[PDB]
Write a protein that binds this ligand. Structure first.
Ligand SMILES: Nc1nc2c(ncn2[C@@H]2O[C@H](COP(=O)(O)OP(=O)(O)NP(=O)(O)O)[C@@H](O)[C@H]2O)c(=O)[nH]1
Ligand SMILES: [Mg+2]
Length: 171
């Protein structure tokens, strides 16, 4: 048995690396030749946060617009949403207001949302500056972290810090 169970759902545009992120955390390896998610995928992992056993239930949703009505049906039952963009794609960033709008209608009003900028191993090809992203997230009152599923940068920290904050929330 665990001390806590939380339901985390990753969302964001197609191609931003939501799958490689979940899989790198949950399996410990960056998945080679990863293809687009069809519908929603589900993964599990139990983690120790300061002696507490926390089971994460993680839903990994399709980016592709055509699955969008179905991925949205998963929001209401989530404890947290990991909203994801790709630092090297300005449009995935520019989309974010629209995602927050969705989350407002379809997620629960107790949902925690974090923002992840993925693919920092490609930092020199970013199209959204660190400062832009931090200013957007300061405006949204949203925790922001820059990750690399590929090279592991901040992938563990992402979910372990969110678990810790979900613990505090449950108390
Ligand atoms: N350099 C680099 N490439 C990455 C990283 N994370 C994912 N990618 C790549 O970017 C592409 C998209 O990855 P994927 O995890 O499928 O993204 P997704 O957000 O789940 N897409 P979908 O919504 O279609 O399921 C893949 O080619 C994957 O290898 C990263 O941290 N760095
Ligand atoms: Mg995917």
């Amino acid at each position: 048995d665990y001390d806590f169970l939380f339901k985390i759902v990753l969302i964001g545009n197609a191609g931003v690396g939501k799958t490689c992120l979940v899989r790198r955390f949950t399996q410990g390896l960056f998945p080679p030749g990863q293809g687009a998610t069809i519908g929603v995928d589900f993964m599990i992992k139990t983690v120790e946060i300061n002696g507490e056993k926390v089971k994460l239930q993680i839903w990994d949703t399709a980016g592709q617009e055509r699955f969008r009505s179905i991925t949205q049906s998963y929001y209401r039952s989530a404890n947290a949403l990991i909203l994801t963009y790709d630092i090297t794609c300005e449009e995935s960033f520019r989309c974010l207001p629209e995602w927050l709008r969705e989350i407002e209608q379809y997620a629960s009003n107790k949902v925690i949302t974090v923002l992840v900028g993925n693919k920092i191993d490609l930092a020199e090809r970013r199209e959204v500056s660190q400062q832009r992203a931090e200013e957007f997230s300061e405006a949204q009152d949203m925790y922001y972290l820059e990750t690399s599923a590929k090279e592991s940068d901040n992938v563990e920290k992402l979910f372990l810090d969110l678990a810790c904050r979900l613990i505090s929330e449950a108390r």
